[PDB]
Structures are given as C-alpha cells and as structure tokens.
Design a protein around this ligand. Structure first.
Ligand SMILES: Nc1ccn([C@H]2C[C@H](O)[C@@H](COP(=O)(O)OP(=O)(O)NP(=O)(O)O)O2)c(=O)n1
Ligand SMILES: [Mg+2]
Ligand SMILES: [Mg+2]
Length: 323
DNA sequence: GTCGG
DNA sequence: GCTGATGCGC
DNA sequence: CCGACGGCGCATCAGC
C-alpha cells in the first residue's frame, strides 16, 4: 500500500489508546486518520500534505513528519519496550478479553498465553472459547472458503424454512479477497417491525447449523444476534480447516435495507455515514432512518440507495465502502 | 485527536 | 426477579 | 474554546 508505513503506525497508536490508555475517542481519531490516508491516491511526502485530509490534525501531522524522516516513531518505540503495555495489548487479542479485563489479568499476574491456559477457570465462557481458538481466529479466510461457507449456510437455512433469506454481509459483501470472519444477515417473513409471528426463528437456524457440525461453539446468543464459531468440513485424510468466527443477525424483514447497509459496513464507513446523517438532520441505525426534530417516525426506505438519497450522498456500491 | 461553530 | 451500568463486541 | 464524536445486542454485575 502507498502509505502503508504511516497507516500501520496510526493503527498501532489507535490500538494503544484503546487497549492501554482506554481513551476511546483517541482510538477512533487514529483509525479515522488511518482510513482517510489509506484511500489517499498519492504517496504522502510530508505531514503538511496529510494535514489537508479530514481527520488528520496537527499532532498526527507531526508524527507523520517524524515517521517519514526516520522510519519510526519514538512514542511507539517506547510503548513496545513497556512490559505492562505489551502484556495488556497481547491479552486483548483474545476474543472476550477487553481493555479492562486485560489490565485486571495483568494485575493478577496472568499475562501470557501459558498463564491463560493455566487459569481457564478465571475466564468467562466467551474468553474461554477465544483462548481455545486464539491461533485460528487470527487467520484470515480466503474468499474461496467464504464461498463454500456461504453455500453451506444458505442451503441449511433453506432446509429449515424455504422462506428464510440469508445474506452474507461484512467484508465479503464488499468484495474482499479475504475476510476476518463471516457475517450473515437473516430475515424471515414471520419477524417484522410490526410483529413476531413465530418464536425461535434464530434458534432454529443455529440448531440446524450445529446439527450438521458447521457451528462448533457459541460465544453469545439472543433472539436476534448469534456470535459463535464455525468450521468447514474437510475431506478424507485432509488437514482440518481453521475454526472461524461467525455472526448472525436476524433483522425485521421490512427493515432489510437498513439492516444490510449496517451489516455491510465497513465500521468506519458506517461511522462516517451516520455522522453525516446527523449533520443532515437524520439518524440512521440498522432498523430505520429517522429525522431529528428527538428522533421522528421512520422514513420510507425501499432500497439501500434511498438511505443515501435522504442524506444527499451519491450511492456507493459495497465494494466502495471499505474505509 | 480532530473538528465545527 | 427487575433495572440500569458497564464491558465487549458487531 | 469546547462539546461532540454511530448506534445497538448480549453477558455480567450491583442495588433494591
Ligand atoms: N464497530 C462496528 C463494527 C462492525 N459494524 C458493522 C459493520 C461491519 O462491516 C459489520 C461486520 O463487522 P466485522 O467486525 O465482521 O467487520 P467486517 O467489515 O466484516 N471486516 P472483517 O470481518 O474483519 O473482514 O458490522 C459496525 O457497524 N460497527
Ligand atoms: Mg466480518
Ligand atoms: Mg463479524
């Protein structure tokens, strides 16, 4: 990538602020700057040039000048040397261990993978599964495997009830050649914003995917959101595929376009778009777009493009939403 | 950390 | 048990 | 200056 050295530096700063400092707005600011620089179509020559981009301010411009001049950032070189920052940043890589829990574990002398494995009884269910698949969860998923997973999920959903519609969203729907996980949007005509005419709609699908041994583990599960683990089947004598993260979101069927907009992302694109909506006098969530008067009644939406129209954005195909 | 009013 | 906060994640 | 920063599901806990 054209400015990969810079965007990597900013991401590392973002992670430090989130995981160690617990300064969430600094985390968001660093990721916004990294995002806008990532899509800038020139090799950046100076901090001043970058400060012209929205989300890059004075402090990030100065860091870019240091990085361009020396290839490194003294602030990060010191952070990498610090044992407590290093430990906390490591522990947060386990799914279910956040900044607070990582600092608590370090206080208790739990700070390596070996320590975690020795202290499984001190982990909640989510953390215990995150530890179990720690290596697998850091692997990426080739799009070819995403296509196999898509075929399994859609066909098994079809067998439960041909009226389900399952849509793979996330980075996959944005056309990524690899994904960190699989995100599945689910609808069924019995579940609308006006009524739930059938119970266990999400459960039935989860159950079926467990029955055929696709879903292997559950991190969390409610009426509309499942968060778990899945695995492709392998052939005779074949090494097994890595276990993968899977999220499933049941959305009211009449609210599919707001739901698919949300679940297609990226997260930064959603943040930019919802922030823009506010400046335009609307609020967007995964169910509705509503005017700000306090939020008013939902506006009619019959395509993803209707949502862009309301906030006066030209439409952006999913592949162009990877901010 | 950055931005807009 | 319920409700509201908080952590963690999408 | 300085308030705002997207919006919400599930797990866990504290207080009643
Ligand atoms: N903070 C976040 C995180 C996620 N999402 C939405 C947008 C994202 O596209 C989708 C799925 O989340 P994800 O973490 O799986 O991200 P992804 O875009 O699929 N990328 P990846 O899974 O790493 O390949 O949920 C969001 O709105 N806000
Ligand atoms: Mg994803
Ligand atoms: Mg996901």
């Amino acid at each position: 990538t054209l400015n990969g050295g810079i965007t990597d530096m900013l991401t590392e700063l973002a992670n430090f602020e989130k995981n160690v400092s617990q300064a969430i707005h600094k985390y968001n600011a660093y990721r916004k700057a990294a995002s806008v620089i990532a899509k800038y179509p020139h090799k950046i020559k100076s901090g001043a040039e970058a400060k012209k981009l929205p989300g890059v301010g004075t402090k990030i411009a100065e860091k870019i000048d240091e990085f361009l001049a020396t290839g490194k950032l003294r602030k990060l070189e010191k952070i990498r040397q610090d044992d407590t920052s290093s430990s906390i940043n490591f522990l947060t890589r386990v799914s279910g261990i956040g900044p607070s829990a990582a600092r608590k574990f370090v206080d208790e002398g739990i700070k390596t993978l070996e320590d975690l494995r020795k202290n499984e009884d001190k982990l909640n269910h989510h953390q215990r599964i995150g530890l179990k698949y720690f290596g697998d969860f850091e692997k990426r998923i080739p799009r070819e495997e995403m296509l196999q997973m898509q075929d399994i999920v859609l066909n098994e959903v079809k067998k439960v009830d041909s009226e389900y519609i399952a849509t793979v969203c996330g980075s996959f729907r944005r056309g990524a050649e690899s994904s960190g996980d699989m995100d599945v949007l689910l609808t069924h005509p019995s579940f609308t914003s006006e009524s739930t005419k059938q119970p266990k709609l999400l459960h039935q699908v989860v159950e079926q995917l467990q029955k055929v041994h696709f879903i292997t583990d559950t991190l969390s599960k409610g009426e509309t959101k499942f968060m778990g683990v899945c695995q492709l089947p392998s052939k005779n004598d074949e090494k097994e595929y890595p276990h993968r993260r899977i999220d499933i979101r049941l959305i009211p069927k009449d609210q599919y376009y707001c739901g698919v907009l949300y679940f297609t992302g990226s997260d930064i694109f959603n943040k930019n778009m919802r922030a823009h909506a506010l400046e335009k006098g609307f609020t967007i969530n995964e169910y509705t777009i509503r005017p700000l008067g306090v939020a008013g009644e939902p506006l009619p939406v019959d395509s993803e493009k209707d949502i862009f129209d309301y906030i006066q954005w030209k439409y952006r195909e999913p592949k162009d939403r990877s901010e």
